[PDB]
Design an enzyme around this catalytic site. Structure first.
Site, PDB file in Angstrom:
ATOM      1  N   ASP A 127       0.788  -1.238   0.000  1.00  0.00           N
ATOM      2  CA  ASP A 127       0.000   0.000   0.000  1.00  0.00           C
ATOM      3  C   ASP A 127       0.826   1.297   0.000  1.00  0.00           C
ATOM      4  O   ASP A 127       0.905   1.961   1.049  1.00  0.00           O
ATOM      5  CB  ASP A 127      -0.862  -0.121   1.283  1.00  0.00           C
ATOM      6  CG  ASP A 127      -1.927   0.964   1.451  1.00  0.00           C
ATOM      7  OD1 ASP A 127      -2.226   1.717   0.523  1.00  0.00           O
ATOM      8  OD2 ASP A 127      -2.512   1.033   2.558  1.00  0.00           O
ATOM      9  N   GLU A 163      -2.563  10.013  -0.703  1.00  0.00           N
ATOM     10  CA  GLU A 163      -3.762   9.207  -0.795  1.00  0.00           C
ATOM     11  C   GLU A 163      -4.343   8.941   0.618  1.00  0.00           C
ATOM     12  O   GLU A 163      -5.560   8.957   0.817  1.00  0.00           O
ATOM     13  CB  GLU A 163      -3.435   7.855  -1.399  1.00  0.00           C
ATOM     14  CG  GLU A 163      -4.677   7.012  -1.675  1.00  0.00           C
ATOM     15  CD  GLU A 163      -4.866   5.814  -0.701  1.00  0.00           C
ATOM     16  OE1 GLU A 163      -4.234   5.758   0.384  1.00  0.00           O
ATOM     17  OE2 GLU A 163      -5.674   4.930  -1.037  1.00  0.00           O
ATOM     18  N   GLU A 164      -3.449   8.696   1.571  1.00  0.00           N
ATOM     19  CA  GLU A 164      -3.861   8.306   2.930  1.00  0.00           C
ATOM     20  C   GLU A 164      -4.345   9.451   3.800  1.00  0.00           C
ATOM     21  O   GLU A 164      -3.880  10.578   3.677  1.00  0.00           O
ATOM     22  CB  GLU A 164      -2.675   7.660   3.639  1.00  0.00           C
ATOM     23  CG  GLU A 164      -2.145   6.412   2.892  1.00  0.00           C
ATOM     24  CD  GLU A 164      -2.955   5.169   3.148  1.00  0.00           C
ATOM     25  OE1 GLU A 164      -4.116   5.246   3.642  1.00  0.00           O
ATOM     26  OE2 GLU A 164      -2.429   4.079   2.815  1.00  0.00           O
ATOM     27  N   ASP A 210      -3.516  -0.998  -6.653  1.00  0.00           N
ATOM     28  CA  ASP A 210      -3.713  -0.635  -5.265  1.00  0.00           C
ATOM     29  C   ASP A 210      -3.664  -1.890  -4.364  1.00  0.00           C
ATOM     30  O   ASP A 210      -4.297  -2.885  -4.680  1.00  0.00           O
ATOM     31  CB  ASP A 210      -5.145  -0.014  -5.240  1.00  0.00           C
ATOM     32  CG  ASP A 210      -5.364   0.961  -4.112  1.00  0.00           C
ATOM     33  OD1 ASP A 210      -4.462   1.063  -3.272  1.00  0.00           O
ATOM     34  OD2 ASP A 210      -6.461   1.620  -4.083  1.00  0.00           O
ATOM     35  N   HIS A 292      -2.871  -1.728   6.722  1.00  0.00           N
ATOM     36  CA  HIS A 292      -2.709  -0.695   7.754  1.00  0.00           C
ATOM     37  C   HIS A 292      -2.169  -1.176   9.078  1.00  0.00           C
ATOM     38  O   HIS A 292      -2.570  -0.658  10.123  1.00  0.00           O
ATOM     39  CB  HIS A 292      -4.012   0.113   7.966  1.00  0.00           C
ATOM     40  CG  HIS A 292      -4.328   1.006   6.793  1.00  0.00           C
ATOM     41  ND1 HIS A 292      -5.318   1.963   6.808  1.00  0.00           N
ATOM     42  CD2 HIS A 292      -3.729   1.108   5.574  1.00  0.00           C
ATOM     43  CE1 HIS A 292      -5.315   2.623   5.657  1.00  0.00           C
ATOM     44  NE2 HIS A 292      -4.361   2.130   4.899  1.00  0.00           N
TER      45      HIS A 292
HETATM   46 ZN   LIG Z   1      -3.623   2.604   2.948  1.00  0.00          ZN
END
Ligand SMILES: [Zn+2]
Length: 323
Positions: A127, A163-164, A210, A292
């Site tokens: 990620d 993005e996060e 992704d 995550h």
């Molecule tokens: Zn992420």
């Protein structure tokens, strides 16, 4: 009034025969990608950090050493965040900037911010350091063929920053780079000098990689307007499998399965999808178990799966571009 923005609706691939498929399989090197493109990215690289700068220089340097005529642009902007105003930088790499149409491959290069915990640092391997490394390896493996582009159609790579979410996802705290770039492209005439078409009309298809790199990914066919391209990925995977060109792979455990997903997944494709750009979202469902957590690291990546996906993606891109 030209109908060129409609060309993407009728565009067909130029399918590779067996001899060409073997050439593509043999021309990509998972070990070279691992050492030269991936490992340098397996660092803390949240927006504005020293690692963000290092990741960006790495991506640009690896593209710059190639023969094809890539034009690099850094799209730097400010946005409000839970921590105040901050600066972000999307990286855009384009072959034939003035060509009207481009097939676009994309991923995000930032890593989610986490304070260090028990000496562990979050590096977001799936990620999305792997997706980033796959784009760089594709540019390297296909360099000779891409050099020939030097259908007014070419290739563009976008590495999104931000993005996060800085905290947990919220509409305003996430997708900083893609929300900004989609709005910018939507308001930029294209090709140069156009009266009424934008860079977004020029995006034939946005292929967003992704959360790739974990074992047994299953990619659903999310959107009806890119379904025929999802079917091409299925066909490519099936033929590479039948030719014995994939490793530790079975059709029962294939990656591209016949199955949709009606829900919405928050990701970098959203700002483009909502402005009418066709999207192929290559994200597995379910997400990698390490999603995550500090375990989204190098050790938990599945080498042969990434290698197989590199082959499938490179064949898809050559067929789309008629190369
Ligand atoms: Zn992420």
């Amino acid at each position: 009034a030209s109908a060129w923005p409609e060309e993407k609706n009728y565009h067909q691939p130029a399918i590779l025969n067996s001899s060409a498929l073997r050439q593509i399989a043999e021309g990509t090197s998972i070990s070279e990608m691992w050492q030269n493109d991936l490992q340098p990215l397996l660092i803390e690289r949240y927006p504005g950090s020293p690692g963000s700068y290092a990741a960006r220089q790495h991506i640009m340097q690896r593209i710059q050493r190639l023969q094809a005529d890539w034009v690099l642009e850094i799209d730097t902007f400010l946005s409000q965040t839970p921590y105040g105003y901050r600066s972000f930088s999307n990286i855009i790499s384009t072959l034939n900037p003035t060509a009207k149409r481009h097939l676009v491959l994309a991923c995000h290069y930032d890593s989610k911010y986490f304070s260090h915990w028990n000496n562990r640092v979050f590096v977001g391997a799936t990620d999305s350091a792997v997706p980033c490394a796959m784009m760089l390896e594709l540019a390297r493996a296909l360099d000779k063929k891409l050099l020939s582009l030097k259908p007014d159609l070419s290739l563009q790579l976008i590495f999104f920053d931000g993005e996060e979410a800085f905290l947990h996802w919220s509409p305003q705290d996430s997708l900083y780079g893609s929300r900004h770039l989609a709005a910018k492209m939507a308001s930029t005439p294209h090709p140069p000098g156009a009266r009424g078409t934008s860079q977004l009309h020029g995006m034939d298809l946005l292929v967003l990689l992704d959360l790739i790199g974990a074992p047994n990914p299953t990619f659903p066919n999310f959107f009806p307007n890119s379904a025929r391209w999802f079917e091409r990925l299925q066909a490519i995977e099936h033929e590479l499998h039948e030719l014995g060109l994939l490793k530790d792979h079975s059709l029962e455990g294939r990656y591209f399965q016949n199955y949709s997903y009606g829900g919405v997944i928050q990701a970098d494709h959203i700002p483009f999808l909502r402005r009418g750009v066709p999207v192929l979202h290559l994200i597995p469902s379910p997400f990698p178990e390490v999603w995550h957590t500090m375990d989204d690291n190098e050790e938990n990546l599945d080498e042969s799966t990434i290698d197989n996906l590199n082959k499938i993606l490179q064949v898809f891109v050559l067929e789309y571009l008629h190369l």
